[PDB]
GROMACS .gro file of N, CA, C and O in nm:
model
   56
    1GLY      N    1   0.584 -17.698 -17.577
    1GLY     CA    2   0.623 -17.843 -17.514
    1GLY      C    3   0.483 -17.928 -17.520
    1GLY      O    4   0.499 -18.029 -17.472
    2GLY      N    5   0.370 -17.913 -17.588
    2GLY     CA    6   0.261 -17.993 -17.567
    2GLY      C    7   0.155 -17.986 -17.693
    2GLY      O    8   0.182 -17.905 -17.768
    3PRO      N    9   0.039 -18.052 -17.695
    3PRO     CA   10  -0.039 -18.052 -17.810
    3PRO      C   11  -0.161 -17.903 -17.837
    3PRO      O   12  -0.251 -17.966 -17.844
    4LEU      N   13  -0.103 -17.793 -17.802
    4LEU     CA   14  -0.183 -17.686 -17.794
    4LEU      C   15  -0.096 -17.567 -17.821
    4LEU      O   16   0.020 -17.587 -17.897
    5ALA      N   17  -0.119 -17.441 -17.785
    5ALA     CA   18  -0.040 -17.315 -17.813
    5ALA      C   19  -0.005 -17.240 -17.694
    5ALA      O   20  -0.080 -17.155 -17.633
    6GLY      N   21   0.115 -17.251 -17.652
    6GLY     CA   22   0.204 -17.187 -17.537
    6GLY      C   23   0.327 -17.163 -17.542
    6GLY      O   24   0.360 -17.040 -17.488
    7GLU      N   25   0.418 -17.239 -17.593
    7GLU     CA   26   0.554 -17.204 -17.634
    7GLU      C   27   0.581 -17.197 -17.772
    7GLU      O   28   0.497 -17.215 -17.851
    8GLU      N   29   0.715 -17.167 -17.815
    8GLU     CA   30   0.728 -17.185 -17.954
    8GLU      C   31   0.703 -17.290 -18.029
    8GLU      O   32   0.653 -17.274 -18.144
    9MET      N   33   0.714 -17.423 -17.958
    9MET     CA   34   0.704 -17.554 -18.030
    9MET      C   35   0.589 -17.627 -18.006
    9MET      O   36   0.584 -17.723 -17.948
   10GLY      N   37   0.455 -17.541 -17.992
   10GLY     CA   38   0.344 -17.627 -17.969
   10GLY      C   39   0.325 -17.644 -17.814
   10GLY      O   40   0.411 -17.728 -17.777
   11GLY      N   41   0.248 -17.553 -17.747
   11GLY     CA   42   0.251 -17.573 -17.593
   11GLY      C   43   0.143 -17.658 -17.553
   11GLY      O   44   0.076 -17.724 -17.615
   12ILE      N   45   0.119 -17.660 -17.411
   12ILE     CA   46   0.008 -17.733 -17.347
   12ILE      C   47  -0.096 -17.641 -17.323
   12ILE      O   48  -0.187 -17.671 -17.239
   13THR      N   49  -0.116 -17.519 -17.386
   13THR     CA   50  -0.227 -17.417 -17.351
   13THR      C   51  -0.304 -17.370 -17.468
   13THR      O   52  -0.256 -17.337 -17.577
   14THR      N   53  -0.435 -17.397 -17.459
   14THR     CA   54  -0.534 -17.364 -17.558
   14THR      C   55  -0.549 -17.200 -17.580
   14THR      O   56  -0.447 -17.133 -17.558
   0.00000   0.00000   0.00000
């Protein structure tokens, strides 16, 4: 859900 790595589709977590 965001510009980082957390969910399958780019998340909000680095």
